[PDB]
Amino acid sequence: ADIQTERAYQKQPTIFQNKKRVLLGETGKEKLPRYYKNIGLGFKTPKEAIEGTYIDKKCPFTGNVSIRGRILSGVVTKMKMQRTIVIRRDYLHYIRKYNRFEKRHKNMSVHLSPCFRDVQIGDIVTVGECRPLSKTVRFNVLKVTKAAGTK
């Protein structure tokens, strides 16, 4: 329950969890030691990462990805898939003949780790480039900042 919802046993692959022990620790405090790492670009790992119990192999903090490439940022529009959200990135494109600009946008399906709970729509995520996680997913949510009005 609460993790094992799939047909296969979910576990962090780096942590061995069947270390035998004597009854003074076998009965006293039962804690699976969590694997987490520190991604390197000044981003600090959230609290829910290092103490949570979720298992996500695509999480940037407790899974097997590395963050290298482009740091970008968008705004959450759709939260309707399993562990992956859709952001929108707005920019101005310079047309040279008219010396002017036009509002364009591009969508990005991006992977959202379960360590970012309380993510609304309309708020600004920071995304980092990883290896291709899916057919259309190449980025990963690294930092969430709320919208302007949510006190």
Binding site: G40, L41, G42, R68
Partner: protein
């Protein structure tokens, strides 16, 4: 393509070889080797286009096949063998020794050195790894690997090789106040003192270098070669001292060389 390419068109050759347009369709196309083909001199270009010892590629074949050319102490019969930055080309029959060092305009100069100097060279360490029962390793900028270096040698330092043994004699560390040559980009061939290094994580670092006359320029970190310690270079420097003149003062020097000579 269905595989690796073997030709080089003459227009797409590197600019600093100073080939011209009309003598052929092809360029010499360097062999694979210790230096990159955008960063090397093939031995055929050094021996007939620079030294004028030959007039054809056939004569370069005849000169090299008599085993007369040693590059870094070893005989090379390959006429497209890529010589590169700070290689010692030593012709024993004429008693000449050369080192490939960039000019202030970013081309390899015909720099003659004494046979005292022709027994060493400087290399830039690009990679350190520990491998297979804890033996530390180097990888220099010309594909040498060295087992058991000094443990103070770190990446981006500059070591000194003895060309017969292949072993390190001493080294310079990467620090502000040491002397550089730029080996890449716009600032190629310039020489000065490190004053600064700003570290951008996940990307390229930028090193600020100060010229001997107070000019200042930046490069990337990979385009930096530490020549000497403090101000003293550990090698002999070419005609210009790594001080790039502007076009106005180069014109003034070229005109002052005509009103005095003649």
């Amino acid at each position: 393509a269905r595989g690796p390419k073997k030709h080089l068109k003459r227009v797409a050759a590197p600019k600093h070889w100073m080939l011209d347009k009309l003598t052929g369709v092809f360029a010499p196309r360097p062999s694979t080797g210790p230096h990159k083909l955008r960063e090397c001199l093939p031995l055929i270009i050094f021996l007939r286009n620079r030294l004028k010892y030959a007039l054809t590629g056939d004569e370069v074949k005849k000169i090299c096949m008599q085993r007369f050319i040693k590059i870094d102490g070893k005989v090379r019969t390959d006429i497209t063998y890529p010589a590169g930055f700070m290689d010692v080309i030593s012709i024993d029959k004429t008693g000449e020794n050369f080192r490939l060092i960039y000019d202030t305009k970013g081309r390899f100069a015909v720099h003659r050195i004494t046979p005292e100097e022709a027994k060493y060279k400087l290399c830039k360490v690009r990679k350190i790894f520990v491998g297979t029962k804890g033996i530390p390793h180097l990888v220099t900028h010309d594909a040498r690997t060295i087992r058991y270096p000094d443990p103070l040698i770190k990446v981006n330092d500059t070591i000194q090789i003895d060309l017969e043994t292949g072993k390190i004699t001493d080294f310079i560390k990467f620090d502000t106040g040491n002397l550089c040559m730029v080996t890449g980009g716009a600032n190629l061939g310039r020489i000065g003192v490190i004053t600064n290094r700003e570290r951008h994580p996940g990307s390229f670092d930028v090193v600020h270098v100060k010229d001997a006359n107070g000019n200042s320029f930046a490069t990337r970190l990979s385009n930096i070669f530490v020549i000497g310690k403090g101000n003293k270079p550990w090698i002999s420097l070419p005609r210009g001292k790594g001080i790039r003149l502007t076009i106005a003062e180069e014109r003034d020097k070229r005109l002052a060389a005509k009103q005095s000579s003649g």
